[PDB]
Design a protein around this ligand. Sequence first.
Ligand SMILES: Cc1cc2nc3c(=O)[nH]c(=O)nc-3n(C[C@H](O)[C@H](O)[C@H](O)COP(=O)(O)OP(=O)(O)OC[C@H]3O[C@@H](n4cnc5c(N)ncnc54)[C@H](O)[C@@H]3O)c2cc1C
Ligand SMILES: Cc1cc2nc3c(=O)[nH]c(=O)nc-3n(C[C@H](O)[C@H](O)[C@H](O)COP(=O)(O)OP(=O)(O)OC[C@H]3O[C@@H](n4cnc5c(N)ncnc54)[C@H](O)[C@@H]3O)c2cc1C
Ligand SMILES: Cc1cc2nc3c(=O)[nH]c(=O)nc-3n(C[C@H](O)[C@H](O)[C@H](O)COP(=O)(O)OP(=O)(O)OC[C@H]3O[C@@H](n4cnc5c(N)ncnc54)[C@H](O)[C@@H]3O)c2cc1C
Ligand SMILES: Cc1cc2nc3c(=O)[nH]c(=O)nc-3n(C[C@H](O)[C@H](O)[C@H](O)COP(=O)(O)OP(=O)(O)OC[C@H]3O[C@@H](n4cnc5c(N)ncnc54)[C@H](O)[C@@H]3O)c2cc1C
Lengths: 430, 430, 430, 430
Amino acid sequence: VDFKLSPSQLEARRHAQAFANTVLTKASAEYSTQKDQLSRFQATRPFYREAVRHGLIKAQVPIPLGGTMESLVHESIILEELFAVEPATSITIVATALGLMPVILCDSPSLQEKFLKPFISGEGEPLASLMHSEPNGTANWLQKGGPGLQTTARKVGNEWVISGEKLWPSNSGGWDYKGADLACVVCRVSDDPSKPQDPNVDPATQIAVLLVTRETIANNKKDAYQILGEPELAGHITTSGPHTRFTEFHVPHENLLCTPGLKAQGLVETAFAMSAALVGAMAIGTARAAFEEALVFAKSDTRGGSKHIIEHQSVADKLIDCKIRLETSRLLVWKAVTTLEDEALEWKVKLEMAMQTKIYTTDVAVECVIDAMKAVGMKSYAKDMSFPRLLNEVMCYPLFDGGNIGLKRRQMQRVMALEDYEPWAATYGS
Amino acid sequence: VDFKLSPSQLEARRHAQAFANTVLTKASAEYSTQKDQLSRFQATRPFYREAVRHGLIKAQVPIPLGGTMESLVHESIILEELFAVEPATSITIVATALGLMPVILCDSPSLQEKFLKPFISGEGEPLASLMHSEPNGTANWLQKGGPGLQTTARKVGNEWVISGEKLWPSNSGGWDYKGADLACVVCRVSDDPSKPQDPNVDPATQIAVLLVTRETIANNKKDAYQILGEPELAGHITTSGPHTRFTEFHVPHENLLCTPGLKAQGLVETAFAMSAALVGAMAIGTARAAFEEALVFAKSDTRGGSKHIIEHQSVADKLIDCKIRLETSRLLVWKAVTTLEDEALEWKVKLEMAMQTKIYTTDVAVECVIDAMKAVGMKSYAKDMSFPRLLNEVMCYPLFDGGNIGLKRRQMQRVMALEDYEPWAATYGS
Amino acid sequence: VDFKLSPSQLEARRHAQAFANTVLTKASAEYSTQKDQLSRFQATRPFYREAVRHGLIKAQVPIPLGGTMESLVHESIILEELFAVEPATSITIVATALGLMPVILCDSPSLQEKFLKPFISGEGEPLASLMHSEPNGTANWLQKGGPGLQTTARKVGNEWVISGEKLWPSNSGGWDYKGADLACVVCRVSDDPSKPQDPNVDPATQIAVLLVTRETIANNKKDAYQILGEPELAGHITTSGPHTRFTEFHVPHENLLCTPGLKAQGLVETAFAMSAALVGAMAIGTARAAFEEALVFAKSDTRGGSKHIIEHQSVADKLIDCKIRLETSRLLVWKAVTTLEDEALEWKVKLEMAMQTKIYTTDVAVECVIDAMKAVGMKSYAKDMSFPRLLNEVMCYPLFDGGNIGLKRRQMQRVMALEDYEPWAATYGS
Amino acid sequence: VDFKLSPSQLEARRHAQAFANTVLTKASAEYSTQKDQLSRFQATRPFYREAVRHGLIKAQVPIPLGGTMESLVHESIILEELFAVEPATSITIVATALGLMPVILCDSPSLQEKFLKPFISGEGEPLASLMHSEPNGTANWLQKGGPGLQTTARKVGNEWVISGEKLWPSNSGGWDYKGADLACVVCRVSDDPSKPQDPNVDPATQIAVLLVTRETIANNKKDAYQILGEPELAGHITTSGPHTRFTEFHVPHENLLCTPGLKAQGLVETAFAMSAALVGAMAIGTARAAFEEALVFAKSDTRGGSKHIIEHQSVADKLIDCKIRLETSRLLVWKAVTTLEDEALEWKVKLEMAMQTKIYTTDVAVECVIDAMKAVGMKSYAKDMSFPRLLNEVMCYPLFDGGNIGLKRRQMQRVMALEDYEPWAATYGS
Ligand SMILES: Cc1cc2nc3c(=O)[nH]c(=O)nc-3n(C[C@H](O)[C@H](O)[C@H](O)COP(=O)(O)OP(=O)(O)OC[C@H]3O[C@@H](n4cnc5c(N)ncnc54)[C@H](O)[C@@H]3O)c2cc1C
Ligand SMILES: Cc1cc2nc3c(=O)[nH]c(=O)nc-3n(C[C@H](O)[C@H](O)[C@H](O)COP(=O)(O)OP(=O)(O)OC[C@H]3O[C@@H](n4cnc5c(N)ncnc54)[C@H](O)[C@@H]3O)c2cc1C
Ligand SMILES: Cc1cc2nc3c(=O)[nH]c(=O)nc-3n(C[C@H](O)[C@H](O)[C@H](O)COP(=O)(O)OP(=O)(O)OC[C@H]3O[C@@H](n4cnc5c(N)ncnc54)[C@H](O)[C@@H]3O)c2cc1C
Ligand SMILES: Cc1cc2nc3c(=O)[nH]c(=O)nc-3n(C[C@H](O)[C@H](O)[C@H](O)COP(=O)(O)OP(=O)(O)OC[C@H]3O[C@@H](n4cnc5c(N)ncnc54)[C@H](O)[C@@H]3O)c2cc1C
């Protein structure tokens, strides 16, 4: 076993760190002066443009698919660097990557050739969005006997018709609410949407994923794709994650990602499980930022006393705790992503690992930010330090990308309950 | 022992509820439109007026001084209710109550009579403020060998001259930066401001407390009292705790609160400790709102499944933990304030009860809010629910009124270390 | 609201402290040489004998019923003092109280007189035991469509026939495995035990509580009542709580506590809800023993340093956390028992309060002892200190009297889920 | 980076499991019948004899020094497997390792040849010990101004004389109280044992390590070396860790490990930082044992209900948290031992890593066992399950090998306070 980093891993770090310091630090001045989420999002476009220019969107796509992603570790290193400085635009890069996952993971080169084209070109500002979450929630979307997704699709001739609403999917509306360049819309298949899901058919066999470009939207009546709102968020105040209403929305069959049923469900599950492992890099960034800021403070400031604040035991205790939290977190992300990349390991193992990582790193990041604030004291509470931003931004991570309570612990529980569950397969083998 | 609320106590709850509901719920519409801390604070004035019109400022003064304060239990019941609904204005009430504290506590009836008058009148918008905190902080203000407080007063003729900077103290600059109607300004006595504190004389013996009114401010050069900044706070976005510079500031010797040194120190210590017991009501209030909103949602939303979300063991586990934290908190405040009121107990015992209370209640209310957010999931993160505000507001408590790490844990540590410490004296007597 | 103790409450403490110091401290010398639970239990007999002679068994019975219990707070104070010193015997006393409760709560004066007789006589060493728990568990004993209690009863002639097994019930075997002087056996009614419980009937309507005395056991064949084992416990090594089998065990109809069904279930629930509020004082005793021994140590040992170990912040923080946990715990227990005695409040409010209290006090007591051990350091690990005893002892409390995870938190969830749940009823009325 | 295990590492696992399964499972039948610590320890000899025959002692010594240690990761794996079945004898192996370390790490070949010879022979039952700990404790042994170690050495002519007491060092008195085969007695240099350590010499300059064999003891007077008593411990009841008095104890100059002062201290600091990393494996083994026992239980027992107890969310949560603690810990330990093996990194980076690892793993292993118990419920409290043994054994870990509170957090805090502290050197290089 080996923890040393390769030159390209060390270079990716230099690269991202450079891009955040020289480019993203300037982001704040443009967005702050806007009135709402949408405007704050729009004011980000130049910085997303610059990330495309730096090859960061191309780096969200595997090399064999023409992208430049070298490994999921490389990715982990890059995301931590971005988020330790500015979660604005950074968040848009990762929402795009999630939007690309269902295509990256489908086993179909002509779909991948087509839809991945803009995102690997090194130009424009193409966005992507995995449109899953809904106003009524999704933690139970696969419960047998329940509602199921309220966004439904049905086949009508040689095209599909979507009906219902999505909430929260980042980038869904694109820069101008004429849609994301590529959006994967997850649907429950139902003939008559005014009839409830059959309580006797396993909801997993009823899942469809329809791709929706700006063109699909243009080829529809203006009212079939309505944007009802844009939630005002506590943190990450520059992302966009609109409310959206499909009313008789027509989608070409050439746009269906795969045969409906368990294969579609499985792609979504595989897409969300991989980001689940990556989200921890995001969390580690925000919390690294809190720790480092607090560290520096405790080492230069006596707070009215004779010695530096770090020389008090309880102040040290907090910084110790934050540090352990960060270290263990980054170790677990690296373990998780490496596990997803091991071809010899059963999926359940890869899934169990990814949930742990998402659960631990995200829960523990919050703790870390708060402790850092406590060590610093009253000064952390004012907007001339980072913490007020960091406080709101960190609280997103345990709730999003599938909440820990409702989704992540549930998926893990399920795997642990199976007869053939091997707790240490990721570490010791079968 | 008995926990039953008397009629007067039940009416103070009713009254406080009815005030928050019909008056404080309208605050947000005014301040939401403002563009910075101070503007936000000013747009609060009409609401402070109402609080005076309901005698809520008058209730901050004990009856022996012509106020309406029935007891510290009443007080706790009042603050909790106010803060459950809206901390704006409500924070100004407590800051003004803090400001009055050392006058209320001193041995001088004629000083009391003179300075309390506007606050027991039932008219206008009288603000008070206890000015202790400084830019270089204060957890060590009494460390023998330390720079001490950097706000110093010397005697010149029959007036005192203040030099130095204050940060944080709520209401210090009044509604209009012409100052509070009463401001206890805490100073270190130093004949030479530019010399360091004599490392040989116990810092406690150098404390003077000087009363500064709006009048005192007018009868001085405009550049002797200057407001340098208003910190943009993470939560409590409508308070004012500005950065004040005293350069050559003249204060009548008549306005000296008491004999400098041990007595002055004793007044500050007794004020801050008292408020430290009451701060928990503020914490409980805020946490209570997080919990209630979360419970109501938990009991009425199925989140896309077949049962209310509260039928999920993990959800209920959060709510239970929240409820537990709240019940234990309040009990501890009541025990606390009662203790401060029992004249048969030594001061060190009360000090211990008050430190405990502040530490537990405020640490635990943060946890309470976060768990409640985790229970509601993703929705808790949009500003169409109360949590974003609460998250921000709740992080003030362990930090403010003497942070738990620097001060409260230290004061409590000092007490337990004393040879005649009696851990249970507050329950079992001596 | 009032927290001051009465003269009779102070007497209860002194009386309990004195009993503990003078009597219970001599027990370790007797039980230490015994080589199994039972022998350790039997060696405890002369200490229970003294506890009776001191009127402590009489003080488990309310006054109208011919006993000397003055209030539940008195009870709480007493038990805390007892468990602060020595769980041996003390556990036997409260276990007897438990065993007596169904009879105390039932509203049948002639049953009480007969069965409560020896426990108020102040002579001998009468044991009572509430026999509920079973080899197979009990967290789900009320689950409709589940197996239900495996101890079942049927009527035949004018007597009831019990079959099945009990496990864990304290004192159930008496001193000599010929039975407790009074055992309350909780049975599920079933005419044919070979048949599973009917999944279409609500399990609570099949509950029966059968009084079993030493004489009852004498009237049966030898293999109708069999002790099959004595669990060796991690801590509380002097208590007895054996594995009993009933085989065609005959019990007279007169010995049935009340009519089978919801009335009998209600007696069982009421009993355990009451014990659940009191168990905290047991938890407080142990945790206090830990806290005190650490405090004394931390104030008189420099651990090779130049100052007392309490002077180091990390140490003080531990002890601070211990104190807070203990203060809050005792506050909650007192609240809980007051609530139980408040006649103007609905059972569901009382239940919730009790569940809350058992959960908090027992979870928190454990952290308190571990923190105590941490502060003291390595020395806490050796049996010339109390900590090894306390560590094993405190771990019992979250597990026993109905575990927090399986039972307590479930009963509390059920109540909070109820449509007409008043979370603050116990505090602010209805 | 890479997590895959090599053939030799998996064989090391296989081999440690088989040894634990076929040999260590048999220890308890011998040591359970015994009366005190020492006898229990002595009943352990045939199993240590079997350990030596399997080459497990030889594996504690690096290959360049005649032993068969392959790497520290190998070592981590071995310890985990051992401690997951039986810490008896296992504890003796790692104590011997710790005892051999300072000979292993000094750069003096003739000492290495002479004193390591028996431990690499694969023959007999040789024991070693690192005698550092003392009655008055040691957490402050390097504090400038303090009394320092109380075991002192003075040079008299051509030999060294030892005056003072040691407590706790495992194996220190050998099998028969005629001494460990190798003792590294850590002393403070003082010509006059009666003189307090000079408050003006940096204590690290006065440290000496003297090597004591069974021969050194035979060549001394009978009462120069007295075993004053064997502490009766909470868990790990089969280890020996005597109270030892050196009175005028004569040691050959050639048995002096290195030059007194910074060199000697450095050897001690290094030995202990290394074990600090390894110790985590021990904590993982214990905690894993708890976790696996609870997991199997939950996956197969319904506790009187209709579904396996793992189907309940509160049970699943506990096991998830357990799992997450175990996973992160192993990762951290492997990261630690790896960091220690890196020659490119500075000592302070390695020490900060080792400190982190000891703290996290030992703290968190406790929470793991206790959560495991609460999952299982009542049944974990009886000795027919592993849990009682585990609870006691797991509380050893945050306290021992230099407790987390007094030593480990202080060593770490010191590192972080330094001007040139790089938090992430071990991850992202210097
Ligand atoms: C910045 C940001 C970016 C986002 N990007 C995307 C995106 O790219 N794509 C996308 O699809 N969505 C996106 N969303 C939504 C995000 O992925 C959410 O996590 C998603 O909405 C799921 O919400 P939830 O986990 O709170 O579950 P919800 O269904 O909303 O339930 C909320 C809570 O109810 C409880 N609960 C419900 N059911 C159960 C149960 N079965 N067992 C136990 N507890 C239960 C839990 O406490 C849970 O936390 C984004 C949101 C944000 C803020
Ligand atoms: C809404 C609001 C209202 C306020 N109202 C008032 C008011 O009315 N009057 C007033 O005076 N101030 C007021 N302030 C400030 C408030 O009282 C703060 O608690 C005060 O500034 C103390 O800050 P601090 O506790 O962080 O200690 P600081 O002195 O600022 O120290 C900062 C941190 O350093 C560490 N530290 C420093 N010394 C030690 C030590 N010796 N041991 C261990 N750790 C140490 C601690 O972690 C501490 O938290 C207000 C602030 C706000 C936000
Ligand atoms: C099974 C077992 C095996 C052992 N094997 C060995 C061995 O092989 N070799 C050996 O030398 N010893 C051995 N010991 C002892 C072990 O190394 C202990 O960790 C050591 O005795 C130091 O204990 P301590 O950390 O509690 O320090 P102590 O000095 O005993 O301190 C006690 C407590 O005081 C407090 N404290 C003291 N100073 C400070 C301070 N500066 N700041 C904050 N808090 C402070 C801390 O809370 C600390 O926990 C063994 C013990 C056991 C149980
Ligand atoms: C000193 C002592 C005295 C005792 N005295 C008595 C006595 O007087 N009378 C008596 O009857 N017993 C007595 N016992 C036993 C005691 O009351 C136990 O608490 C009782 O056996 C219940 O066990 P349990 O709570 O672990 O539930 P179990 O039914 O054994 O459940 C075990 C575990 O499974 C899980 N679980 C089970 N069901 C659920 C669920 N549906 N939801 C979530 N999790 C679940 C939980 O983790 C739970 O902790 C005594 C024991 C001791 C040690």
